[PDB]
């Protein structure tokens, strides 16, 4: 009987409990690597005289720099795997999320007081967890680097590359480990875990934009000094290595001084009454969204300020046929590609706020199914004055994430140019063309819930559904009659001619007629609990 | 009369009969419904309330139909439900003003008495509640509320037996101000403590009603 | 003597004494362990367990202590939560056999007629599991088991009265095989069922012992 008695059981618990959301992102991060990224730099930049225009391009934008990181050489490996930079960054948020799923937010449950009340020792969980994120980090470093030595590059850099991907992952396992300590409440240990993370992001982009000596100062930064494909530097992996090491003995001391049920921090009290607004569910609703609200409208404004930038420059670094004036002429604005570029780039952001607006819509089936619509609707509320308080949230949040990013497109285009006064209009209204989009899968959803409830979270398949369309319709072979089952090839483009405005109302109408039916099939329906 | 069901039925799959011939009358007392889980207890509370729409009989609460008038009934009636789950990230207090101001009033004068004498503190946020914290929060927001009907389903869940007393007496209290209660509360102590004229009801059908 | 304390003390800000001199004797009977839920009845469970460290007095599990040898005196112990949320996405069998696999033993002659007459369906999810439901896992995970000590805390939470009587049929039957039981209920009709000896503690004492 050790302090570690019961580790491989529960580790076997955890593989179970999710074990088919890890294959997912352990796959999805590292397979469309060789098969994404390097072969479309084959395909758009077949020879080298291609890819040294193409590093200079990107070594004279700070606004390009920064997001992904420096270009060394022209190598084909080096300038395929720089967008793959920010692979660095999403495995370390996989890896957080899920160490806090099974070491907090286990024991605020309740469970690991049952599971302690076995024949468990007292550091088996955290060594469980750890186990299991060290492992995940590690296969999908490996998965990546076999994809890489499939094809035609620098078998020493591919080797590299996916060193530097598991050492960027059991790092965060690390920080997320000591994380997991410090409170409580789960949602405050990835608040911050995920404050180290961002605080760790922006130091390492202000040091790229600028003269290079602060992004040492960062554990993302030490991943892309490496340098695979451009001359590596092995000896910065041991300089991860430990780091790692020493966060992981600080996890253990943390937990050897502390009771099982929380400790380390005190929360916070504060109101002792109702202030004159939380009084409805239009109130309540805003206290239940105001976050996500913040944060979706922060990203969002965010990528469509990097996106502004880009848009000039695009048209010289680019076209000339360079296997680009084919899907850009099509998708696109079908012309002046610094015109179509802009039309092809919000529709990313239109389908960005649509996956925004599913959210606040399915928080009304998290309420239903949480046992709290009927404490709600057993008051005198109206069965459609509820439920017009989370759709209300969500149209006008994705109505504001859309016009801000606009916003801040249009800054940044004017002032790349010189003149504001021309553009602004121009890209808030190709932002605000997007919306009778976006409000799909809203009026989906709400159809949705009123009709089957259960198949509520299909909505998700819907939209992924849609977008497979428009790649994979547009990129390959298509009948025309197959494309036009999707809202966002049908937005019409603002600026110069062929502006039409009749698919708006064809799609404002759909809006509408879905949220009216599943309206009314929801005010004579069992409220199924 | 309050309530007044009889010949209540319903289907579900329409092949589980929770209800057939169902029966209860209610005149401004305490009245007890006792019966097993799937006896279909939960249903009677569900429709009486607006959430489910009965196949047959007569449901007449407060001299109105529980479908069709369901919001206009609902600000004379107050609701404890059988499994009590909150906001995680607001407070006590905030939990019972916004219940309170969602069905027609709240007494304050009766709502600090109440968390005086349950022992409550209505500053911490409700996901740090226990399971006995828990039951206070919608206890109190029930008992200090304009409400000339209570519909209690396991009232006292979790509570030791200090605020089970404290919480019998102020059923008691609440009795002689003309407030009707139900109970409904798998405790058959507490049941014979407080209420006269039980009703006992197997499958749909009431088996046992009386003094 | 399974359990034996006296002395008992822990202060846990250091400024909330939930336990001084505190005392408990079991010897392979059912004891009720009688309280308020702030008076230390909790912090007295979890002491036994392996999971918090007393500042004072003799704790001693089944010879052992329960700091040191929490792993060795597991295995003939079992227990049931005041309050657990199961994990959503396992059924109710297999919960009931990845808790088995950890206490290191199930008798499955045992597990068959429990989940018979619990009237438990063990193929839907935790998830769907009603509060009644939930229960039945826990009940049934711990009596089907090769324990010699009953740790029981609020057992019958949510069951109806017939499950009630179950329950009570269930722990008599166990209590003639040589198991030890503690029951630490908050209700008191069953702890005059099924105990002797109980014993009555206001704020970390003992304020009352005996049959
Ligand atoms: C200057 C300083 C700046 C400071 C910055 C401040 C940041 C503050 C952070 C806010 C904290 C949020 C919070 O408190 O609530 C937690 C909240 C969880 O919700 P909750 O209400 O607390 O409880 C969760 C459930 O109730 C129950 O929880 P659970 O225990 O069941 O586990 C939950 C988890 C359990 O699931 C798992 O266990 C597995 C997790 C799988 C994650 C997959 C990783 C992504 C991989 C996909 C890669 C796709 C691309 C590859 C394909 C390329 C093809 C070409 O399920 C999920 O939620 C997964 C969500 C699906 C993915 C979400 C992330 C998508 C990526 C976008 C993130 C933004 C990065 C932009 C770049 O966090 C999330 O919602 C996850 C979203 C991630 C947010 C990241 C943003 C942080 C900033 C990063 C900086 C980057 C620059
Ligand atoms: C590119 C990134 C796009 C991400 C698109 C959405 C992914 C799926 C989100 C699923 C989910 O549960 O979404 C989460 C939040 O996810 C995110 O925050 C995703 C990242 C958004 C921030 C970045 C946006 C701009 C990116 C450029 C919803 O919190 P919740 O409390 O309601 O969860 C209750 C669960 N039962």
Redesign the interface.
């Known amino acids: 009987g050790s302090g570690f008695t019961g580790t491989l059981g529960l580790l076997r618990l955890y593989l179970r409990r999710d074990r088919v959301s890890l294959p997912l992102w352990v796959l999805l991060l590292s397979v469309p690597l060789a098969t994404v990224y390097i072969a479309s730099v084959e395909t758009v930049y077949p020879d080298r005289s291609a890819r040294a225009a193409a590093a200079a391009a990107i070594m004279a934008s700070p606004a390009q720099r920064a997001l992904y990181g420096p270009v060394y050489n022209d190598s084909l490996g080096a300038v395929g795997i720089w967008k793959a930079g920010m692979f660095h960054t999403l495995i370390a948020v996989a890896v957080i999320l899920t160490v806090i799923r099974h070491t907090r937010a286990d024991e605020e449950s309740g469970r690991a007081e049952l599971i302690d009340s076995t024949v468990v020792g007292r550091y088996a969980n955290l060594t469980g967890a750890l186990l299991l994120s060290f492992g995940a980090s590690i296969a999908t470093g490996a998965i990546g680097a076999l994809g890489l030595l499939a094809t035609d590059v620098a078998p020493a850099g591919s080797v590299a590359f996916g060193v530097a991907l598991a050492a960027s992952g059991m790092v965060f396992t690390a920080v997320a480990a000591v994380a997991a300590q410090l409170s409580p409440s789960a949602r405050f240990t990835r608040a911050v875990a995920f404050a180290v993370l961002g605080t760790a992001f922006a130091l390492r982009a202000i040091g790229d934009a600028g003269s290079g000596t602060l992004s040492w100062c960062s554990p993302l930064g030490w991943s892309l000094q490496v340098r695979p494909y451009a001359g590596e530097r092995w000896w910065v992996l041991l300089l991860s290595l430990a780091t790692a090491a020493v966060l992981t003995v600080l996890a253990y001391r943390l937990r050897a001084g502390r009771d099982v049920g929380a400790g380390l921090i005190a929360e916070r009290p504060g109101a002792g009454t109702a202030g004159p607004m939380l009084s409805e569910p239009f109130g309540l609703a805003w206290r239940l969204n105001r976050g996500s609200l913040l944060l979706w409208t922060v990203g969002l404004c965010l990528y469509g300020l990097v996106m502004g930038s880009v848009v000039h420059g695009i048209g010289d670094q680019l076209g000339d046929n360079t296997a680009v004036r084919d899907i850009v002429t099509r998708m696109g604005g079908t012309g002046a590609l610094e015109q179509a570029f802009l039309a092809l780039a919000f529709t990313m952001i239109g389908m960005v706020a649509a996956a925004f607006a599913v959210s606040l819509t399915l928080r009304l089936h998290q309420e239903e199914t949480g046992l709290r619509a009927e404490t709600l609707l057993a008051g005198a509320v109206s069965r459609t004055h509820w439920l017009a308080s989370h759709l209300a949230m969500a149209l006008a949040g994705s109505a504001v994430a859309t016009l801000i990013s606009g916003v801040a497109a249009g800054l940044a285009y004017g002032m790349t140019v010189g003149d504001v006064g021309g553009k602004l209009p121009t890209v808030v209204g190709t932002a605000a063309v997007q919306l009778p989009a976006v409000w799909l899968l809203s009026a989906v959803t709400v159809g949705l819930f009123g009709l089957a409830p259960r198949f509520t979270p299909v909505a998700w398949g819907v939209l992924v559904g849609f977008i497979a369309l428009y790649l994979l319709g547009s990129l390959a072979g298509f009948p025309q009659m197959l494309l036009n089952l999707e809202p966002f090839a049908h937005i019409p483009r603002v600026g110069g001619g062929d502006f039409t405005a009749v698919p708006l109302l064809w799609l404002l109408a759909i809006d509408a007629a879905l949220i009216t039916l599943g309206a009314m099939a929801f005010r004579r329906r069992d409220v199924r609990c | 009369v309050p309530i007044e069901i009889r010949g209540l039925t319903k289907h579900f799959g329409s092949v589980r009969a929770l209800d057939g011939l169902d029966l209860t009358v209610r005149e401004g007392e305490v009245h007890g419904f006792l ?3 799937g006896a279909g207890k939960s249903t009677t509370l ?1 429709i009486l ?5 009965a196949d047959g009989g007569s449901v007449r609460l407060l001299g109105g139909d529980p479908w069709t008038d ?2 206009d009934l ?2 004379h009636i107050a ?1 404890v ?3 009590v ?1 909150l ?1 995680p ?3 006590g ?2 939990t ?4 309170a ?4 009033g709240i007494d304050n004068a009766r709502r600090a008495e109440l968390i005086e004498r349950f022992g409550l503190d ?4 409700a ?2 509640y ?3 914290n828990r039951q206070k929060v919608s206890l109190i927001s029930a008992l200090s509320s304009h409400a000339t009907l209570l519909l209690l389903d ?1 009232p006292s ?7 089970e007393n404290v919480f019998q007496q102020c059923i008691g209290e609440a009795r002689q101000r003309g407030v009707t209660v139900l109970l409904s509360s ?4 507490e049941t014979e403590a407080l209420c006269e004229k039980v009703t006992i009801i197997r499958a749909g059908k009431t088996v046992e009603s009386g003094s």
């Open positions: 019966g097993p889980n569900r309330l607006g959430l489910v729409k369901a919001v609902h600000r609701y439900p059988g499994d789950t906001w990230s607001l407070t207090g905030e019972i003003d916004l219940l101001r969602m069905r027609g209505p500053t911490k946020k996901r740090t226990s399971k006995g396991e869940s979790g509570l030791d037996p200090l605020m798998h405790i058959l102590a």
